[PDB]
Amino acid sequence: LLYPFPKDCSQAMLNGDTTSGLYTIYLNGDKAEALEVFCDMTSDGGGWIVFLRRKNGRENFYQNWKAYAAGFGDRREEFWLGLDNLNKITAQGQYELRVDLRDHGETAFAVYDKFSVGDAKTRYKLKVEGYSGTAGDSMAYHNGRSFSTFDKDTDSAITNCALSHKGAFWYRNCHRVNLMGRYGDNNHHQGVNWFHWKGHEHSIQFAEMKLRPSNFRNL
Ligand SMILES: [Ca+2]
């Protein structure tokens, strides 16, 4: 195989794996760092590690710092991959972000050709740049922010965004993207929001965040 120990879903796809599902990747190509991820092998060329999925409200996303650091949920259904995992993956090279949104027969997307998450000491600082798509550029507002949970507030408000909105995100004061919000909650700022597509009073039915090497698009 080209990559006996594929470090992301694009290497898995380059080995010949073409169907979406659970795959074992190996951080830094290291056999000892196995991580089971869901690969989206069909959207926009495939090769995508999914790290957030919302689709039915069964999982609770009002979780604490340790839980967002470690990941939670069923990776075949609603889940969060974990911030430690995201940092280790984005530290393996130059990665891009894709967000897929679906709601009552409508769809939209956003791609950011530069995406990285810092380590725990940086409180998982977000870098997200180079927008294209149809959802509207709602992540720009969050670029440069650290992550916040109700028990570790790093946002730019004197209040606690995560506590107030009962979610977690790279909050500022507070958000334009809230994809770890309260499922089906159309109250202002509470739901699964992508502001520049459907605003702050509409919770989106289906959302995925996913990443892959940015140069994979050029292959
Ligand atoms: Ca605060």
Residue numbers in the entry: 1976 to 2194
Recite the paper's sentences.
Using sequence alignments, we identified two amino acid substitutions that could account for the lack of interaction between RPTPζ and TNN or TNX. First, Y2140 in TNC (Y1294 in TNR), whose side chain hydroxyl group makes a hydrogen bond to the main chain carbonyl group of Q369 in RPTPζ, is conserved in TNX but replaced by a histidine in TNN. Second, S2164 in TNC (S1318 in TNR) is conserved in TNN but replaced by a histidine in TNX. The effect of the Y2140H and S2164H mutations in the interactions between TNC and RPTPζ were thus analyzed in an Alpha-based competition binding assay. Introducing changes to histidine at positions Y2140 or S2164 prevented competition, suggesting that each mutation is enough to eliminate interaction with RPTPζ. Not surprisingly, a variant of TNC that includes both the Y2140H and S2164H mutations could not inhibit binding between RPTPζ and WT TNC. Finally, the crystal structure of this variant is identical to that of WT TNC, indicating that mutations at positions Y2140 or S2164 did not introduce any gross structural alteration that would account for the lack of interaction. Overall, these results validate our structural analyses of the interactions between RPTPζ, TNR, and TNC and explain why RPTPζ does not associate with additional tenascin family members.
PNNs are a condensed form of neural extracellular matrix that include the glycosaminoglycan hyaluronan and extracellular matrix proteins such as aggrecan and tenascin-R (TNR). TNC and TNR share a common domain organization that includes an N-terminal cysteine-rich region responsible for the formation of disulfide-linked multimers, followed by 5-14 epidermal growth factor (EGF)-like domains, 8 to 9 FN repeats, and a C-terminal fibrinogen (Fg)-like domain. Here, we demonstrate that TNR and TNC associate with the single fibronectin type III (FN) domain found in RPTPζ and provide a structural basis of these interactions. Overall, our findings provide novel structural insights in the interactions between RPTPζ and tenascin family members, prove that the formation of a RPTPζ–TNR complex is essential to the assembly of PNNs, and provide a blueprint to explore a potential role for a RPTPζ–TNC complex in neural function.
